[PDB]
Specification:
- This is Penicillin-binding protein 1b.
- Keywords: Acyltransferase, Carboxypeptidase, Cell membrane, Cell shape, Cell wall biogenesis/degradation, Glycosyltransferase, Hydrolase, Membrane, Metal-binding, Multifunctional enzyme, Peptidoglycan synthesis, Protease, Transferase, Transmembrane, Transmembrane helix.
- It comes from Streptococcus pneumoniae (strain ATCC BAA-255 / R6).
- One of its GO terms (molecular function) is penicillin binding.
- Its EC number is 2.3.2.-, 2.4.1.129.
- The protein has 3 domains: 71 residues, Alpha-Beta Complex (Penicillin-binding protein 2a (Domain 2)), CATH 3.90.1310.40; 295 residues, Beta-lactamase (3-Layer(aba) Sandwich), CATH 3.40.710; 66 residues, Rossmann fold (3-Layer(aba) Sandwich).
- Helix 4 runs antiparallel to helix 13, helix 5 crosses helix 7 and helix 5 crosses helix 10.
- The longest helix has 21 residues.
- A 5-stranded mixed beta sheet has the order 2-1-3-9-10, covered by helices on one side.
- It is elongated.
- A hairpin with a 5-residue loop joins strand 9 and strand 10.
- The N and C termini lie far apart (79 Å).
- With 469 residues, it is α+β, with helices and mostly antiparallel strands.
- The structure holds chloride ion (CL) (25 copies) and magnesium ion.
- One chloride ion binds next to loops.
Length: 469
């Protein structure tokens, strides 16, 4: 009698979401094992008939085989998450029909999946929205693929200025943020807190112009993106991910830049204790510690600003002591109406959350801002009540390798002389500490001080800055 067991070795079942997710992964591991055991080549495995036979053999081996499958699942936490979506899933319903949901709770130091939500109710809809369904990550792409890489490459710091002046995509369409064609210059913090699109567009254009190996970062975290030239990649264009995979990207940022591959199976043993499969940790430093810890500070303010999510308000009410843990996160609640995301981390855990409709029809404007935020506050509370210490009371902190530059608020660069209107200007004013992940920190102010912007923008920006001296 084969048994899928929780992490602690309490049997889930002999051979709901947990069962079919565990079984599917165990079948794939058994396929690999049996093909290797039977000395089946790479070439042989490409044969569709041979693959079909080995898939069936793997299934029957699990069914008949007496294997012990050890999972990463924390039974009490996963059970609490199932109770939470049963009790509070209705809070997602926003008047666009029944809203589906996927969540993955992941240990930041290991990539172990402690629990997940597959959907509203397996008995009514079996689609697994945690592991199976691929959806655009929307504006939750920006920290990983635009800002995080730009910081890591020493192309921006925490108080760098970006253009949010109106601009068009290559196809001539304006870059929009709800009904806004844009504003003017803004800090990285304001860009992230609001999830403005134009600054993220310019950041990714800067990476492309500089020939940065973005694919190198994203593939080290297990992402599959077919076309890296898509202008809207930071806004989730040209990318579709599972919740489990995308949670793994946020795991990397939360774990001071070190990726651990997500997993739900730790081990499969034969009845006699022969190891069929064992997960092997392969940590990768995807972002520098400086980059990851700078990004943690920025994503702390995304949540505390409450601009794009009510989460901190919701959680403070449910569980003020847990709200005082060091939450960081990023929304996908502003750019688009088919997929709403909230990614949350403390130093110990990351929780990914998606909501949407199976057929991709639009959610309400505020489904991500309020409904998903309230649901995820309930889910976080349920996890803590099941396992009081699991989120932890540790703080995210800047790595000592972070470089601190005194820069002008106005330019995000060090005070000095710039040519404006044909004349040398001494640029002074209010200064701020800007965090950098390079050696030398911020450069001296240049005329084109911002990420992105047209001549005309810079004429407008410098007119205001010169006005202020
Ligand atoms: Cl389940
Ligand atoms: Cl499933
Ligand atoms: Cl056999
Ligand atoms: Cl357990
Ligand atoms: Cl997955
Ligand atoms: Cl999608
Ligand atoms: Cl343009
Ligand atoms: Cl702000
Ligand atoms: Cl690339
Ligand atoms: Cl992917
Ligand atoms: Cl490319
Ligand atoms: Cl796995
Ligand atoms: Cl997995
Ligand atoms: Cl055996
Ligand atoms: Cl490092
Ligand atoms: Cl609020
Ligand atoms: Cl957002
Ligand atoms: Cl979005
Ligand atoms: Cl649907
Ligand atoms: Cl601490
Ligand atoms: Cl320093
Ligand atoms: Cl300095
Ligand atoms: Cl440098
Ligand atoms: Cl630029
Ligand atoms: Cl212009
Ligand atoms: Mg992958």
């Amino acid at each position: 009698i084969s048994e899928i067991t929780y992490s602690d070795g309490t049997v889930i079942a002999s051979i709901d979401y947990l069962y079919f997710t565990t079984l599917a992964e165990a079948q794939e591991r058994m396929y690999d094992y049996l093909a290797q055991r039977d000395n089946v080549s790479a070439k042989e495995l490409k044969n569709e008939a041979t693959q079909k036979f080995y898939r069936d053999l793997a299934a029957k081996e699990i069914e008949n085989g007496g294997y012990k499958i050890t999972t990463t699942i924390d039974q009490k936490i996963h059970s609490a998450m199932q109770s939470a979506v049963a009790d509070y899933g209705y809070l997602l319903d926003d008047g666009t029909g029944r809203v589906e949901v996927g969540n993955v709770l992941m240990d930041n130091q290991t990539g172990a999946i402690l629990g997940f939500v597959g959907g509203r109710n397996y008995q009514e809809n079996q689609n697994n929205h945690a592991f199976d369904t691929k959806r655009s990550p929307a504006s939750t792409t920006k920290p990983l693929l635009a800002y995080g890489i730009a910081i890591d490459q020493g192309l921006m710091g925490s108080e760098t200025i970006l253009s949010n002046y109106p601009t068009n995509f290559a196809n001539g369409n304006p870059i929009m943020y709800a009904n806004s064609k844009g504003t003017g210059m803004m800090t990285l913090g304001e860009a992230l807190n609001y999830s403005w699109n134009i600054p993220a567009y310019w950041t990714y254009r800067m990476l492309r112009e500089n020939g940065v190996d973005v694919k190198g970062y994203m593939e080290k975290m297990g992402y599959e993106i077919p076309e890296y030239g898509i202008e809207s990649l930071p806004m989730g264009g040209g990318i579709e991910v599972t919740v489990a995979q995308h949670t793994n990207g946020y795991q990397t940022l939360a774990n001071n830049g070190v990726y651990h591959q997500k997993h739900v199976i730790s081990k499969i043993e034969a009845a006699d204790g022969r190891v069929v499969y064992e997960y092997q940790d392969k940590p990768v430093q995807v972002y520098s510690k400086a980059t990851a810890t700078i990004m943690q500070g920025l994503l702390r303010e995304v949540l505390s600003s409450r601009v794009t999510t009510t989460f901190k308000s919701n959680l403070t009410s449910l569980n003020p002591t847990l709200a005082n843990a060091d939450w960081i996160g990023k929304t996908g609640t502003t750019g688009q109406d088919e997929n709403m995301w909230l990614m949350l981390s403390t130093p110990r855990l990351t929780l990914g959350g998606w909501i949407g409709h199976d057929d991709n029809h639009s959610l309400s404007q505020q489904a991500g801002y309020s409904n998903n935020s309230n649901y995820m506050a309930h889910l976080v509370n349920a996890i803590q009540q099941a396992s009081p210490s699991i989120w932890g009371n540790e703080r995210f902190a800047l790595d000592p390798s972070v470089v601190k530059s005194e820069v002008l608020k106005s330019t995000g660069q060090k005070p000095g002389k710039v040519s404006v209107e044909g004349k040398e200007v001494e640029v002074t004013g209010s200064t701020v500490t800007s965090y950098w992940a390079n050696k030398s920190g911020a450069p001296a102010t240049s005329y084109r001080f911002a990420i992105g912007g047209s001549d005309a923008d810079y004429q407008n920006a410098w007119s205001s800055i010169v006005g202020s001296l």
